[PDB]
Amino acid sequence: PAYRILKPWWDVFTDYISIVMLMIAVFGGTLQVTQDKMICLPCKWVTKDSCNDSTGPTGIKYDLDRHQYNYVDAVCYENRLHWFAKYFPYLVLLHTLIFLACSNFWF
Amino acid sequence: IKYDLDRHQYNYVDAVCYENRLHWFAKYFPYLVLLHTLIFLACSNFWF
Amino acid sequence: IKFDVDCTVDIESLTGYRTYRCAHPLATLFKILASFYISLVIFYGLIC
Amino acid sequence: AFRVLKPWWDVFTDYLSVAMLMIGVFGCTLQVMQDKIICLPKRVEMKGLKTDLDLQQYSFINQMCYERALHWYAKYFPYLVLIHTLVFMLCSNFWFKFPGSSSKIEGDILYAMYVRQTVLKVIKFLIIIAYNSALVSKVQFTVDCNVDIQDMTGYKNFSCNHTMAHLFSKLSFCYLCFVSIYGLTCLYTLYWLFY
Amino acid sequence: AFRVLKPWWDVFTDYLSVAMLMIGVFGCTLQVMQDKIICLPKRVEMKGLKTDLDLQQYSFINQMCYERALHWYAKYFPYLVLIHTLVFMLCSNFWFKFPGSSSKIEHFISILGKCFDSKVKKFRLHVEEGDILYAMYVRQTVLKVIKFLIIIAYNSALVSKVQFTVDCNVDIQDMTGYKNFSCNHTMAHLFSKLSFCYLCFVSIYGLTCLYTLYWLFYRSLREYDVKNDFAFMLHMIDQYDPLYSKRFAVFLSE
C-alpha cells in the first residue's frame, strides 16, 4: 500500500518499538511456559514461620519422595509467588496488542 | 511423611484422577473455544 | 521479582513441614526483561 | 531504492550482520534449552562416594550456584550478542528507514546522518571489543562455588561444570572474529568519508 | 542473467552444495538435541553391580568425559561441514554478488537478448578490455579444487576417529570415587555413515571440479575474433546452449 506517506517519523518509531516489545513478550512467554518452575526445600528449624538457618559434612535428609517435591513446588508457585513474576510476559503481550490496536485503528 | 509409592504409582494415580475427577470444562476449554471461533468465522464468511 | 521466596503454604498433612524456601530460576532474567520493557515503555510514552 | 543504491561494503556488512544474527539466535536457543550447570559437593576395587542428596537438593544447589557464582558474562552472552547485532542492523538501515531521509533518497542533512551512523558504528565496534576481549577468558568449563546453602543441603563448597561454556568458548571466540572483519568493513566506510 | 549463465557442471555443484548444507543442518540439529555420552565406572544366575552413584554424579561424569575424552572432530563435524558448505556457496555466488561483475554480466545479458530479438561496437571496446573475469573464474575453480583436495585428504583419516565406545581417565575421584570410565557416544555410528555420505558428495564435487579443469585447460579459451573476456563469455553461453552463439555472431559481422 501507499499509506507510507501518512505515517510521521514518530509513528514508524512506535511501530518498531511495539515490534520489539512484542518480540520480548513472545520470548518471555515461551520461557515462562517451558521452564518456569520453583525449586523448594523445606526448612527443618523454623523460627516464627521463617528459616532460622542455624568428620566431613553429610547431606541432610528430608525423607521426601520426588512427587512430594513436585507437589510442594506446584503449591508454592501457585500461592506464594507474586502474580507479576508469573504473568509478566502475558501482560506485556496484552499491552503491546492494545498499543498496536490504538496505532492502526484509524487505518 | 512417607507413602511408600514409587514414581510410576504416582503417575498412574495422576492419570486416573485427571481422567475421572477433573471437570471437563477445565480439560476441554481450548477445544470448545477453537470450535466456537471456527463456527463464528464460518458464519461471518458463509455468503462470500 | 525475587530469586528466592519463602512460602508458608501450610500443608503439613501432605508433606509434614511448615515453611519452605524456594528458588525461582527465571527471576533474574525476568527482572532484566522487565527493566528492558519499562525502558521501551518510557520511550514510547515520551514519543506519545 | 533498495538494491542499486547499496555499495559493495554495505552489502558485505549486511551479510556479516546476518551471520552474526544467526549465531546469536543459535546461542540464545542453546541458552534457552540446553544451558544448565551440574554441581557436586566438594569435600565429603573402589566403591562410590555417596553423598545422600535427593534430586531436589541437587537442583537447588545447581540453581543457587548458577545464579550466584557464575559470572554474568557467561550467563547473558547470547542476549548481549543479539542486542548488539540488532542495533548494528538498525543503524545500518536507518539511512533508509528515516522518513526525512527516505523522502529525499526515494540541505546536507542526508550526509550528516550518514557520518553520524558511521561514527556510531565505529564506537560500537570499539566498545564491543573493549569488554568482549577482556571477558571471553572469564568463562570456564569448571567453577567452584562457596554458597550459603548449608542447613539446607549440608555442604558449603561445590565443584560445578557449565556445560555450554565449551561451545561458548568455541562460539564467542569465533563471534569475535566476525567482529574484526566487520570492523574493517566499518572503518573503510569511515575512511571513505575522510580520505 | 540467471539461467543462461549456469553450465551443467555449475548446476551439479549447486545441487551438491544444497545437499551438503542440508546434511550440515541436520547434523547440527542432532548435535543440539540428541548428542550425549553415557558413562559408567570402569571396574568396581547373576546379580547387579551397584556402584552407588547418584543420578547427579552420573551426569557430572557424563559431562566431564564428554567434554574431555570425546574427540574434537566428533564434537564439531556438523559445524565443520556447515562452514565448508557456506564457504563453497559464498565463493560460487560471490562472482555475481560483486558489483563490478554485476555491471558486466547485466550488460552482457541485455546485449545477448537484443541480439536474440533479431551497442556491439561499444561492447567490443568496453567489454573486451577485461580478461580478468576469465582469470577470476579460473582462480575460483582452482580454489574449489584446493578445498576439495584438502577436505577429502584430511577427512578420510579423522572419519575413523569417531567411535561408538570410548574410554576416559579423568580426575573425578574424591567427587565420585572412580578414575576410569567406559562410555558410549550414542549417535557416533550414525555420524559415521553421515560423514561417509558427506565424503561421497564432496568427492563428486571434486570430480565435477576436475572436469571443469578439463573444460578450462584444454583449448586455451583466451582466443576465439574476440579478446579473452569476450571469448570466455561466449564459451559460457555456448556451453549453456550451442545455438545462441550463432545468433550472437551476426552483429559482430560487418
Report the interhelical angle of D77-97 vs D109-135 (nearest 10°). Answer: 170
Contact D63/C28, CB-based, under 8 Å?
A: no
Q: Which of E59, E57, E53 is nearest to E36 (CA)?
A: E59
Q: How was this structure determined?
A: cryo-EM
Contact D40/E175, CB-based, under 8 Å?
A: yes
Nearest to D46 among E32, E60, E177 (CB): E177
Which chain B residues are Cβ-neighbours of A66 within 8 angstroms?
Answer: 7
Distance from CA of C45 to the nearest CA of D (A): 20
Contact A67/B2, CB-based, under 8 Å?
A: no
Dihedral in degrees, nearest 10, Cα atoms D49, D52, D54, D57: -90
- E196 contacts: CB under 8 Å, gap ≥ 6: E159
CA distance D85 to E231: 45
CA distance D54 to A64: 8
HSE toward the beta carbon, residue A99, CA cutoff 13 A: 22
Instruction: Please note each residue after which chain E is broken, C-to-N distance over 2.5 A, or write none.
Output: 44, 118, 224
DSSP string, A5-66: GGS-HHHHHHHHHHHHHHHHHHHHHHHHHHH---EEEE-SSBSSSSB--------------H
3-state helix, strand, coil in chain D (%, to 5): 70, 10, 25
Q: Which residues of C touch A (CB under 8 A)?
A: 1-2, 5-9, 11, 14-15, 17-27, 29-30, 33-34, 36-37, 40-41, 43-44, 47-48
Distance from CA of D86 to the nearest CA of C (A): 15
The answer to whether E213 and E141 have CB atoms below 8 angstroms apart is: yes
Distance from CA of A70 to the nearest CA of B (A): 11
Report the interhelical angle of B7-20 vs A66-79 (nearest 10°). Answer: 50
Chains with ≥3 CB–CB distances under 8 Å to E: D
Is residue A74 within 8 angstroms of chain D, CB to CB? Answer: no
> What's the one-letter identity of residue C23?
A
Distance from CA of C15 to the nearest CA of A (A): 7
Q: Which residues of A touch B (CB under 8 A)?
A: 63, 65-68
Other CB atoms closer than 10 Å to residue C39's CB: what's the count?
10
What value does the CA radius of gyration of chain B take, rounded to a whole number of Å? 20
> What's the one-letter identity of residue E62?
N
Distance from CA of D181 to the nearest CA of C (A): 30
CA distance D133 to D176: 8
Is residue A40 within 8 angstroms of chain C, CB to CB? Answer: yes
Nearest to D38 among E41, E43, E60 (CB): E60
Which chain D residues are Cβ-neighbours of C32 within 8 angstroms?
Answer: 76, 79
Tally C-beta pairs within 8 A across A and C.
Answer: 111
Resolution value, angstrom units: 3.8
Chains with ≥3 CB–CB distances under 8 Å to D: A, C, E
| Three-class DSSP category at E182 | strand
